[PDB]
């Protein structure tokens, strides 16, 4: 029922930007780059912030001012755009990353004023930790009634269903993770 209108408008306009932004020469820039995502190893598409700026200042400003709230809707736009063009296994998921941002902030300027806003910094690395797999969307099997629960999205602590859609089950604990149809992403700290 409820819909975040601001987010939906951003999704529509960002899709139009990807499909309509012609180069200095005449071909659609990001359409050509998108073809590399067919490779198994590739997940992330890089977008230039100044290119985004040329389409409309309102969209540029909204993205920077509302980034964390809006970000998952940009991924859906790229997912849709790629799916149109060439065949890829449908279980794969795609990511958007921005660069050429016009400004820079000091470490001591990073304060709770700008939680959630798009930002750029620089520093010197002291230590770097191993790679791990991180769960983003779980699939669970409810054992007492043999029914599957899909796209259980995670937050900081590991969360799961406790009662299923199937009403006769009366379960609370007997749930099994499908580690073959769940999906993960690579994670690293520095």
């Amino acid at each position: 029922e409820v819909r975040d209108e601001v987010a939906e408008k951003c999704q529509k306009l960002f899709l139009d930007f990807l499909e309509e932004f012609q180069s200095s020469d005449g071909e659609i820039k990001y359409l050509q780059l998108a073809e590399e995502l067919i490779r198994p190893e590739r997940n992330t598409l890089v977008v230039s912030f100044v290119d985004l700026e040329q389409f409309n200042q309102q969209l540029s400003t909204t993205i920077q001012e509302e980034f964390y709230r809006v970000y998952p809707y940009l991924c859906r736009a790229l997912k849709t755009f790629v799916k149109d063009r060439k065949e890829i296994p449908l279980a794969k998921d795609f990511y958007v990353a921005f660069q050429d941002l016009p400004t820079r902030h000091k470490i001591r300027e990073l304060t709770s004023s700008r939680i959630g806003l798009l930002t750029r910094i620089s520093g010197q690395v002291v230590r770097t930790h191993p790679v791990h797999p991180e769960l983003v969307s779980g699939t669970f099997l409810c054992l007492d009634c043999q029914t599957v629960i899909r796209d259980v999205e995670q937050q900081f602590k590991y969360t799961q269903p406790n009662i299923c859609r199937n009403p006769v089950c009366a379960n609370r604990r007997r749930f099994l993770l499908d580690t073959n149809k769940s999906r993960f992403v690579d994670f690293q700290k520095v």
């Binding site: 010197q124 002291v126 230590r127 770097t128």
Partner: protein, 283 residues
Amino acid sequence: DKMNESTRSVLHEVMEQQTLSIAKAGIICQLNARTSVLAAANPWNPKKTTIENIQLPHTLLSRFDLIFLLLDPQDEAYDRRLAHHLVALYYQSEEQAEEELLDMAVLKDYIAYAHSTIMPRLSEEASQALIEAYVDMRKIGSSRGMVSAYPRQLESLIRLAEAHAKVRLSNKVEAIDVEEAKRLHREALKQSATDPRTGIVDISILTTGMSATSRKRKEELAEALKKLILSKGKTPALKYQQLFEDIRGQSDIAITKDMFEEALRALADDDFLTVTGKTVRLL
């Protein structure tokens, strides 16, 4: 004067390369370390030059643009003036402390302004004077048939002349700066690099750590030691103590254990002998 060898090594690296290198615990990087050094050092003994008295090597001492020596003059008028200045300081009062403070603030502003905008650049007169100064220092060695100037000395003169030009707030470095730079450099050479054994500036003090007198004495001792061993050359092994007593019985100088062993080491590097404990053996 009493920093350790590792500190001396990293200091040498910084003053030559103007950067510092790190490789530890997974961290590998290079840092900018372009810093101006001002150092205070200790051993006085007038019979020996500064580097001959203090601990540190010539590798480091040869990097300073100027070197100064501070000691008492044994002058009644100097003590009287120093005590009078001390008495004046005992009665030090706001009537002049405020004036000195104001001049200090103005001097900070002067330095900051000059540093912010002024860039002295070469003139024909300064170039001629600097070339002539280098030629003077090469000529000073020519009477002894030896080197007495190299490019690092000319760099010190150039830096001092640029600084003096900047003090005048001049965008040109000129003969005024070079003559003062020559004066300071000559005075510094006189005080820092004079051999007190002759009253003459000996550059080998600053480039090797000793007067040429020491070098000559060491060579003569090595030749005397070689002649003593050769005079007993029918024997393959000679006792260390016997050779020390022979040398000390034939020398006018009271030769030390260190001098004797340095001569033995020199003759070993010359492949003339091998020292096996208390016995010296011929090659």
